[PDB]
RNA sequence: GGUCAAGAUAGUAAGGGUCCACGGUGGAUGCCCUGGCGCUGGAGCCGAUGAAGGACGCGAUUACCUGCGAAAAGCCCCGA
Protein backbone atom coordinates (compact mmCIF):
# COMPACT_ATOMS: atom_id res chain seq x y z
CA UNK A 1 0.00 0.00 0.00
CA UNK A 2 2.53 2.31 1.34
CA UNK A 3 6.08 1.24 3.01
CA UNK A 4 9.41 -0.73 2.26
CA UNK A 5 7.01 -3.80 1.90
CA UNK A 6 5.64 -2.66 -1.62
CA UNK A 7 9.04 -1.46 -3.62
CA UNK A 8 10.56 -4.72 -2.26
CA UNK A 9 8.27 -6.63 -5.10
CA UNK A 10 10.04 -7.67 -8.81
CA UNK A 11 10.16 -5.57 -11.76
CA UNK A 12 7.01 -8.20 -13.67
CA UNK A 13 5.57 -8.03 -9.98
CA UNK A 14 5.10 -4.47 -10.33
CA UNK A 15 2.89 -4.92 -13.96
CA UNK A 16 1.07 -7.72 -12.32
CA UNK A 17 0.38 -5.95 -9.34
CA UNK A 18 -0.98 -2.71 -11.71
CA UNK A 19 -3.31 -5.14 -13.74
CA UNK A 20 -4.47 -7.06 -10.98
CA UNK A 21 -6.05 -3.38 -9.24
CA UNK A 22 -7.17 -2.68 -12.72
CA UNK A 23 -9.31 -5.99 -13.39
CA UNK A 24 -11.44 -5.68 -10.43
CA UNK A 25 -11.72 -1.70 -11.01
CA UNK A 26 -13.49 -2.52 -14.30
CA UNK A 27 -15.72 -5.02 -12.56
CA UNK A 28 -16.61 -2.17 -9.68
CA UNK A 29 -17.49 -0.07 -13.51
CA UNK A 30 -19.93 -3.17 -14.73
CA UNK A 31 -21.05 -3.93 -10.71
CA UNK A 32 -21.61 0.40 -10.75
CA UNK A 33 -23.54 0.13 -14.23
CA UNK A 34 -25.55 -2.54 -13.33
CA UNK A 35 -26.54 -0.79 -9.73
CA UNK A 36 -24.66 -3.30 -7.37
CA UNK A 37 -21.76 -0.14 -5.83
CA UNK A 38 -22.55 -0.46 -1.67
CA UNK A 39 -19.01 -0.01 -1.76
CA UNK A 40 -17.98 3.62 -3.73
CA UNK A 41 -14.70 4.34 -1.87
CA UNK A 42 -13.27 0.95 -2.79
CA UNK A 43 -13.23 2.94 -6.65
CA UNK A 44 -11.14 5.96 -4.95
CA UNK A 45 -8.70 4.03 -2.81
CA UNK A 46 -7.81 1.30 -5.89
CA UNK A 47 -7.03 3.95 -8.09
CA UNK A 48 -5.14 5.52 -5.49
CA UNK A 49 -3.12 2.36 -5.08
CA UNK A 50 -1.90 1.88 -8.55
CA UNK A 51 -0.75 5.89 -8.47
CA UNK A 52 1.57 4.80 -5.89
CA UNK A 53 2.89 2.01 -7.98
CA UNK A 54 3.32 3.93 -10.89
CA UNK A 55 4.98 6.58 -8.72
CA UNK A 56 7.52 4.15 -7.38
CA UNK A 57 8.13 2.06 -10.69
CA UNK A 58 9.34 5.48 -11.40
CA UNK A 59 11.71 6.41 -8.00
CA UNK A 60 13.58 3.22 -8.81
CA UNK A 61 13.87 3.77 -12.36
CA UNK A 62 15.76 6.94 -11.46
CA UNK A 63 18.09 5.45 -8.50
CA UNK A 64 20.78 3.37 -9.29
CA UNK A 65 20.68 4.61 -13.32
CA UNK A 66 22.12 8.10 -11.46
C1' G B 1 -108.36 67.41 6.53
C1' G B 2 -110.53 66.09 0.39
C1' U B 3 -111.05 67.34 -5.07
C1' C B 4 -109.58 70.97 -8.89
C1' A B 5 -106.06 75.00 -10.32
C1' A B 6 -101.68 77.99 -9.98
C1' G B 7 -96.57 78.11 -8.38
C1' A B 8 -92.14 76.47 -6.45
C1' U B 9 -88.89 72.79 -4.84
C1' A B 10 -86.65 67.77 -3.40
C1' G B 11 -84.81 63.00 -4.18
C1' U B 12 -82.87 58.90 -8.63
C1' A B 13 -76.67 57.95 -10.62
C1' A B 14 -76.03 54.13 -15.93
C1' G B 15 -71.71 56.14 -15.20
C1' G B 16 -68.26 60.32 -13.80
C1' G B 17 -65.54 64.03 -10.39
C1' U B 18 -62.56 65.69 -5.66
C1' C B 19 -61.07 64.06 -1.05
C1' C B 20 -60.14 60.14 2.65
C1' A B 21 -59.24 54.73 4.08
C1' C B 22 -57.35 50.19 2.66
C1' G B 23 -54.92 47.46 -1.09
C1' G B 24 -52.27 45.63 -5.93
C1' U B 25 -48.56 46.91 -9.34
C1' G B 26 -43.66 48.85 -9.77
C1' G B 27 -38.59 49.33 -7.86
C1' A B 28 -37.18 55.13 -6.58
C1' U B 29 -35.19 56.14 -1.75
C1' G B 30 -32.39 54.77 2.96
C1' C B 31 -29.25 51.17 5.00
C1' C B 32 -25.83 47.48 3.71
C1' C B 33 -21.53 44.49 1.11
C1' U B 34 -20.04 39.93 -1.23
C1' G B 35 -17.84 44.11 -6.39
C1' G B 36 -15.15 48.01 -8.75
C1' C B 37 -11.90 52.62 -9.54
C1' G B 38 -7.67 55.68 -8.67
C1' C B 39 -2.82 56.81 -6.44
C1' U B 40 1.49 55.00 -3.77
C1' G B 41 4.95 51.21 -3.33
C1' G B 42 6.53 46.20 -4.64
C1' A B 43 7.44 42.87 -8.23
C1' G B 44 8.28 42.06 -13.79
C1' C B 45 9.21 38.12 -19.13
C1' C B 46 6.98 32.80 -20.64
C1' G B 47 8.40 28.77 -24.69
C1' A B 48 11.23 22.59 -28.71
C1' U B 49 12.43 19.80 -21.08
C1' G B 50 6.87 22.02 -25.80
C1' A B 51 4.28 27.98 -24.06
C1' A B 52 0.17 31.69 -24.17
C1' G B 53 -4.51 29.83 -25.13
C1' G B 54 -7.70 25.66 -26.10
C1' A B 55 -10.23 20.68 -27.33
C1' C B 56 -11.72 15.87 -25.05
C1' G B 57 -11.67 13.74 -20.44
C1' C B 58 -11.21 12.40 -14.84
C1' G B 59 -16.60 12.18 -9.88
C1' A B 60 -20.70 6.22 -6.60
C1' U B 61 -24.26 10.19 -8.44
C1' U B 62 -21.76 15.45 -12.54
C1' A B 63 -25.16 19.43 -16.71
C1' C B 64 -21.91 24.45 -14.90
C1' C B 65 -17.48 26.22 -12.42
C1' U B 66 -12.95 24.64 -9.82
C1' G B 67 -8.63 21.35 -9.64
C1' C B 68 -6.42 17.78 -12.19
C1' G B 69 -4.51 14.97 -16.43
C1' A B 70 -5.70 7.91 -18.42
C1' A B 71 -1.03 7.60 -12.10
C1' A B 72 -6.60 12.15 -14.08
C1' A B 73 -11.23 16.98 -7.59
C1' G B 74 -5.30 13.79 -7.60
C1' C B 75 0.40 10.17 -6.67
C1' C B 76 5.49 10.52 -3.78
C1' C B 77 9.18 13.45 -0.48
C1' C B 78 10.41 17.38 2.93
C1' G B 79 8.85 20.94 6.36
C1' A B 80 4.58 23.79 9.23
Given at each position: ???????????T???????????????????????????????????????????????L??????
Open positions: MKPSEMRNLQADFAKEIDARKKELMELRFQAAAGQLAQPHRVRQLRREVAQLNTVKAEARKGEQ
